Amino acid sequence: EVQLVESGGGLVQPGGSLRLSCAASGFNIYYNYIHWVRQAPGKGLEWVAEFSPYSGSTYYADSVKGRFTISADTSKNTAYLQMNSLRAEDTAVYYCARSAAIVDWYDYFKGFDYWGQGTLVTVSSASTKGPSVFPLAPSGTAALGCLVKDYFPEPVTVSWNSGALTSGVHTFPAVLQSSGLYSLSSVVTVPSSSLGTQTYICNVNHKPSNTKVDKKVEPKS
């Protein structure tokens, strides 16, 4: 079974460098075409590069020409994408895709057949900051939640009641504040009668910084 595995992404500073690797299985990448496609958060797909080790030809999108170099190593059946002079707009999920060899000169391009799961690359001068979790005060059914704020980089997984409360939860997509840090909210809708007896604690998980926070929510006086 053909599989494409991306790796190498993470946090990089503006003007810094990064090198992604696309380890392939199930097929020999030699005669085929390896591509790199990136997708900004909430945006569409953008092809950036294509490589064919048989012909050695490298083709890049105009938005990355001169900064991105695509290559491969047939010894390990792995392609590479070296990114130099990285800018903030280069922050995206980077997929590596495979295009089959030109077997028919009429149907010369038969689409990007298989894709990888993609690796996230964040270009920002911010530092890895732990999330600051704050409770959302709950004033026929009441609404409460948690506000996690000033964390970097993405993502953050939020659970409720150690993963036992799932019906009615709303973990919103994160927003990028002007300070370069991320901030999202996670609300929930639980009956007001069970607000005093049943305790509601949100489990905030930031794996980049290894910060586990369990903040309880209670109505103010």
Partner: protein, 213 residues
């Protein structure tokens, strides 16, 4: 600011509908147009390749056709698993380009949002910043306007929105607007309001509060 790709356009449809997404391709001789399907958090999946050929494993409701320069993707009977984002791909001048993106969305009756406004937690005021959030729970369509009012003064530029993905069964959306203020500016005003307008609201709904109950 510097957007590298436009956001995916929306298309409201019901299950069983017949949809046809057109891809304007000036490179008609490059009839290698391919269509892809992408769902939230997942990688794109090849559906149509070489303008009209069906990829191995894709249901029969998907079809591709080319009429001169216009390439189309047609779903005969829209199914619950078909609501996703669809991209068109063109190969031209040694460059591969993807389309803008068409997000097929489930259509339902209009549902007014439930509004809740939450003052900041005192642990945050001690940090030096105030964050008032406004919750818009379970509404349709996703088009909603949130206006922050500080002492009956209309705000702009000191808030950020965030809308969730459509619910699979309710077909609803949820918005969270976070008004961020400093500890000094927050203590200088009393009433903070969150005005919400929607298609299902004949009049704007305001959920407000006073600093300190």
């Amino acid at each position: 600011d510097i957007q590298m790709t436009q956001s995916p356009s929306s298309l409201s449809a019901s299950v069983g509908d017949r949809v046809t997404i057109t891809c304007r391709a000036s490179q008609s001789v490059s009839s290698a147009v391919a269509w892809y399907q992408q769902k939230p958090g997942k990688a794109p999946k090849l559906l149509i390749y070489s303008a009209s050929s069906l990829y191995s494993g894709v249901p029969s409701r998907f079809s591709g056709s080319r009429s001169g320069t216009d390439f189309t993707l047609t779903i005969s009977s829209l199914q619950p698993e078909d609501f996703a984002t669809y991209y068109c791909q063109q190969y031209g001048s040694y460059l591969y380009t993807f389309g803008q993106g068409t997000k097929v969305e489930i259509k339902r009756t209009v549902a007014a949002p439930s509004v809740f406004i939450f003052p900041p937690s005192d642990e945050q005021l001690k940090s030096g910043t105030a964050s008032v959030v406004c919750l818009l729970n379970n509404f349709y369509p996703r088009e909603a306007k949130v206006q922050w009012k500080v002492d009956n003064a209309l705000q702009s530029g000191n808030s950020q929105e965030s809308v969730t993905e459509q619910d699979s069964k309710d077909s609803t959306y949820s918005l969270s607007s976070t008004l961020t203020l400093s500890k000094a500016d927050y203590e200088k005003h009393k009433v903070y309001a969150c005005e919400v307008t929607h298609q299902g609201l004949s009049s704007p709904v305001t959920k407000s509060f006073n600093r300190g109950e």
